[PDB]
Amino acid sequence: VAGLLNRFLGMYVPKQLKWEKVRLDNLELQREALLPINVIKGHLGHLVLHIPWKTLASEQVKINIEDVFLLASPKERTQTFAQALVTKIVDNLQITIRNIHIRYEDAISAPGHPFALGITLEEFSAVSTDSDWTPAFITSIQSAHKLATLESLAIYWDTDAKEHDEMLKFFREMISEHQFILKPVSGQAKIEIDKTGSHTVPRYKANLLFDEIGVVLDDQQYRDALMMVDLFHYFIRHQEYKKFQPKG
Amino acid sequence: LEGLVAGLLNRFLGMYVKNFDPKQLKWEVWNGKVRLDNLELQREALDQLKLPINVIKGHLGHLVLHIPWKTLASEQVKINIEDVFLLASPKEEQKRTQTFAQALVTKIVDNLQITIRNIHIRYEDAISAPGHPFALGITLEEFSAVSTDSDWTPAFITSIQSAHKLATLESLAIYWDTDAKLIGPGREHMLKFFREMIASSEHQFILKPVSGQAKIEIDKTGSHTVPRYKANLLFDEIGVVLDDQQYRDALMMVDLFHYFIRHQEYKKFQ
């Protein structure tokens, strides 16, 4: 239990953690946490895990994360029991995250016109539900029904734009006149994941109800839109690009 | 105005329609409405999109155009199209008159009201992913677009700075068939096949039918101060579904979207 958490945590991010409730603050992620983005800097403000250790496997767990930011840039026997434990505990957990700001700044691309790319979301909630989308603690084999809830989803992409205490404020102030492309939107998504692996049923089903999406484009963004398409293809498919890098 | 608009119509039509004849338009002298039935589209019809695609077959079942000649300056044109089917395949390797026609067309399309019904666009690809042919599809029960005011009320409007359009989609569905059975350029007026599409498990739908409304505001100023494009979308529950077969082909598909988008820049001269 505690050892698993500690080891995993150790690498992404110890004596004090005792796995009794838990509480953490001001965790700075590693530069090698993972996408080709090199994490220039990464920071998680506050984190909380509430484990019902005595009553585990009867009722769902809880983890609440407050203030996580991410900054990035382009770059040149016992184990089987443990695994089943991790499976059952992760299958019915509830995650609640607020104030998340992933901002990715590219300077090398579109040379001479550096841009900053950004995703803003100040509340996300994913929980396990039953076949009929009423939330519950169901343990099932055939399919997993997750329900996520998404408040203030916003994306900004602004062309021609550029210490720990200052940086945190900068990352958190945005959540209003930046060149947003996706106005803040709130909605709910019903994901259903198949575990049978059968070829008669889909791997993923999603029913997302969103309200009032507004998307805005400007002349700079419209000009760089094709360049941007190239960018996203690159994130998603970088290994295919790898052969073309020079080997003289 | 009747003769000029008629000739312009024959230019525009002539660009996209296979074997066009000016005799194809049927006019109603009683009101000045014009209708066309059973159009055939040319292979190069979708070129304006600059995609490496080839239109094996296209069909416009019924097309009707209502023009208010008498009140045309003060009232909008209307166009209804029914049964549009597109089967595309990937492609392997006087001064006053000109000015007046441009301004006239500008007024017409600025307040045009379009309603299209029973749309099926099908992309059959056997060349890429060889041995694993697939078919992509977009179906639309109805698509409509009208020009409106600042407050989204349909009205004839002429504004120098801004253009407001309200488009409604009813029953839009996208299907991605893996290892699909292709109609092909089999020349079997295909027509029946799209007939079945008007109307389930014969297609693998990544997008189950959804209806929605788009409020678009365009800025013709070109001013940096205001966004060139604005859009507000209100939709119904959106149901997306991923096959296990489609998920294995997903990365290849991302490749395809990019290759299509960027094809213009890799032109080969000869």
Preferred mutation among A182, A233, A241 to probe B, highest tally of B CBs within 10 A: A233
Q: Which amino acid is at A208?
A: L
Contact list, A210 vs chain B (CB under 8 Å) = 235, 238
Does residue A226 belong to the interface with chain B, where contact is any CB pair within 8 Å? yes
In order, the DSSP letters of A8-58 are HHHHH---S-------EEEE---TT-----EEEEEEEEEEEEE--STTBTT
By Cβ distance, the residue of B228, B232, B254 closest to A212 is B232
Preferred mutation among B178, B215, B229 to probe A, highest tally of A CBs within 10 A: B229
Whether the Cβ atoms of residue B12 and residue B80 lie closer than 8 Å to each other: no
CA–CA separation, B114 and A153 (whole Å)? 33
Does residue B29 belong to the interface with chain A, where contact is any CB pair within 8 Å? no
Determination approach: X-ray
By Cβ distance, the residue of A212, A219, A226 closest to B228 is A219
Q: Which of residues 194-223 of B touch A (CB under 8 A)?
A: 222
Asked if the Cβ–Cβ distance from A218 to B227 is below 8 Å, we say yes
CA–CA separation, B61 and B83 (whole Å)? 5
By Cβ distance, the residue of A199, A216, A233 closest to B229 is A216
Q: Is A65 helix (H, G, I), strand (E, B) or coil?
A: strand
Q: Which amino acid is at A145?
A: H
CB atoms within 10 A of CB A143: 13
Q: How far is A182 from chain B (nearest CA, A)?
A: 10
B188 CB-near residues (< 8 Å, 6+ apart): none
Exposed, middle or buried: residue B48 (CB in 10 Å: 0-12, 13-18, 19+)? exposed
Range of the domain at B201: 1-270
CA–CA separation, B197 and B194 (whole Å)? 5
CA atoms within 13 A on the CB side of A11: 8
Element (H, E) at B171: strand B162-178
Whether the Cβ atoms of residue A172 and residue A101 lie closer than 8 Å to each other: yes
Asked if the Cβ–Cβ distance from A237 to B254 is below 8 Å, we say yes
Q: List the one residue out of B234, B226, B124 whose CA is nearest residue B178.
A: B124
For chain B, the domain total comes to 1
